[PDB]
Amino acid sequence: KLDTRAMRHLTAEDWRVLTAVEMGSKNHEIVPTPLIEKIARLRGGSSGVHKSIATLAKAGLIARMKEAKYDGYRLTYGGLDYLALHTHAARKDVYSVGSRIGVGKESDIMIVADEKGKQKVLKIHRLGRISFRTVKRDYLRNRSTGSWMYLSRLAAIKEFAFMKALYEEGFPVPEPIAQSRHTIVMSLVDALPMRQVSSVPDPASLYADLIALILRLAKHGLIHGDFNEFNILIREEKDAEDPSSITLTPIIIDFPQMVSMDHPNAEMYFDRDVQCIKRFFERRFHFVSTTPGPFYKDAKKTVGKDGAKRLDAALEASGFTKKMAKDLEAAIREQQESR
Ligand SMILES: Nc1ncnc2c1ncn2[C@@H]1O[C@H](COP(=O)(O)OP(=O)(O)O)[C@@H](O)[C@H]1O
Numbered sequence: 001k002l003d004t005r006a007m008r009h010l011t012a013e014d015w016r017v018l019t020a021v022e023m024g025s026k027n028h029e030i031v032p033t034p035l036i037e038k039i040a041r042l043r044g045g046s047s048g049v050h051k052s053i054a055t056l057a058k059a060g061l062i063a064r065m066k067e068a069k070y071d072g073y074r075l076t077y078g079g080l081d082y083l084a085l086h087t088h089a090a091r092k093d094v095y096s097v098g099s100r101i102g103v104g105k106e107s108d109i110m111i112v113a114d115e116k117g118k119q120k121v122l123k124i125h126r127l128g129r130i131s132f133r134t135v136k137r138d139y140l141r142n143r144s145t146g147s148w149m150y151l152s153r154l155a156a157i158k159e160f161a162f163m164k165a166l167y168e169e170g171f172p173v174p175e176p177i178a179q180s181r182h183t184i185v186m187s188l189v190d191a192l193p194m195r196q197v198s199s200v201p202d203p204a205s206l207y208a209d210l211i212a213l214i215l216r217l218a219k220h221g222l223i224h225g226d227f228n229e230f231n232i233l234i235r236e237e238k239d240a241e242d243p244s245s246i247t248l249t250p251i252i253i254d255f256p257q258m259v260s261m262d263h264p265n266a267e268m269y270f271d272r273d274v275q276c277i278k279r280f281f282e283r284r285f286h287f288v289s290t291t292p293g294p295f296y297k298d299a300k301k302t303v304g305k306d307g308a309k310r311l312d313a314a315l316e317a318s319g320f321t322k323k324m325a326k327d328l329e330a331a332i333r334e335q336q337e338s339r
């Protein structure tokens, strides 16, 4: 997990040296000691960066690496986390971090609060993470640390861009607030995952709403790619006239895996989303639509007909190379393929 205890022990040039290790690892993974010194130069003028280095090493924000010629330090995952938080703090998006952290298979979910005391969600992407069970909590070593960090950066950038596009089009998604490195700060939605919804008296309405969402997404050029009972939140509201009836409003989250309706495998991704919904509705509410499909060939005819803005171009905006997209999709497909 992630502990933010040390976060306040850190001085101004502890941050500067940490940041210097980050910048110097742009090219190579190990950053030689005298290159930290040069990058960290304030005026400058180190002048006691050597001490900061030990502080950061002790706190596990960087780690010493001795190699044939390259003798220096690398940033750790904790170090990147800290750098992200610092950026959110400095831009005043995050004032405090909650005691409650949700450790997931591909991301960590934290609750944070700003200076006004408003609670928001901090999502930290964790591509590469694997856990080991003893036969009688780690990262998969087919990639270096810098590669996993790079991929999680791409994941956060992608998700944030899609959350912006979707939010501005009027889709029910969290409000995106800020993005730094592998992290996103977004609004806290007052809804819980559909997986745990305790009672649905009218499955057919909710089903129709979810199906309309998949079709609405497709009309805007998108396929969610992980559309299931964990990525659908249900807002519950008691009706004004009688409180016995509860109106249910679905909200969608979790977008680093979204694909365009033009993706070579779009039909498989479309069909898979729909089948996930049907499966869930069959096992959880014993509900089965009499309505066939919807089928991909139907959906594709609808993009982007009428006013439909193509949201699958939000990625072009950032500086997302085709290489970055292939890198990310490969890492993602690998994650979900081995669940
Ligand atoms: N904005 C939010 N508001 C409320 N709950 C959220 C929000 N984002 C995530 N969650 C909770 O965290 C869980 C995981 O979030 P998600 O974005 O799906 O992360 P992961 O990529 O690890 O699946 C969700 O199922 C939900 O319980």
Ligand SMILES: [Mg+2]
Residues within 6 Å of the ligand: 230, 231, 253, 254
């Ligand atoms: Mg999810």
